[model samples]
Target: DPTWVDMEAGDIALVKSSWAQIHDKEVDILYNFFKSYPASQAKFSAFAGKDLESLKDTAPFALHATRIVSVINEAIALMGVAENRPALKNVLKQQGINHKGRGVTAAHFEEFETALEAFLESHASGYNAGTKKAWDSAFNNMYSVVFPEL
Candidate 1:
């Protein structure tokens, strides 16, 4: 079972700040994910058999990266609002259903989270204990709906 922790105002601010720094850097974020976990590359249909450097010049790589970033952006925007719970759940549950069909497991989702944390930690200047907790809270909020069947 997983825990669902509510975030503080400060936590949301800190997380938003940290994520703001990298959310726009979609290509970089995706490249980091694939680099950290090469096994995940196979899942990225347009991006495989090549290093991050080579992947950058291709349009598909950047396009796919932006797509993932947008999903993250949507989650970030909706997760903190109580009124948006239903909408958020719909988006996340659909994502889970789609990914589940693609053979994505809970462990793979965790692995992605692990890599994302590493990226954020390295990129965000204010990744202190408070910020980490906030990120954890956010991730938990997302996984709560996205992995219910996993």
Candidate 2:
């Protein structure tokens, strides 16, 4: 069973606002992700062994990046409704299953978590300690569900 984090309205606002700032930078985000952890890209059959610069402009890369952004967007949107916990769990669990098949470990996600925070710190407008804390809750909440299946 996944336990839901108690997010106040202000925390939710912080997360959404911060996300809105960089949500459109999906390609850059994924590019940065792979740049930060080249080993991660090696796990992706489509992206493995490709030059990061060349891959950045390809349709397939953009498509995968969009999928990444959409999952975060969907999960954040679901946070608005208390009734959406089950839906959220299903989403994260599915993510777990998908990645599990890909041999993605918890360390990969932790690396992503680190890289994502650095990306937000540099790109997200007005990102501060409070915002970081809020995002921490969000990540912890999602990982609580996702980690078990991994």
Best by TM-score: 2
**When superposed on Cα atoms, how far off is each prediction in RMSD?**
1.6, 1.7
* Model 2 C-alpha lDDT per residue in residues 1-150, reported as the tens digit of each score: 346677787888899889999999999999999999999999887999999999988999999999999999998888767799789879999999898888988778889989999999999978889989998888878788888878
Where model 2 places Cα greater than 4 Å from the true spot, the runs are 1-4
Predicted structure 1, TM vs. truth: 0.90
The best candidate by lDDT is 2
Q: Per-model C-alpha lDDT, please?
A: 0.81, 0.88
For residue 59, what is the lDDT in candidate 1?
91
Scored by lDDT, model 2 comes in at 0.88
User: Each candidate's TM vs. the true structure?
Assistant: 0.90, 0.94
Q: What is candidate 1's CA lDDT for residue 72?
A: 75
RMSD of 1: 1.6
Clashes per model (N, Cα, C within 3 A): 0, 0
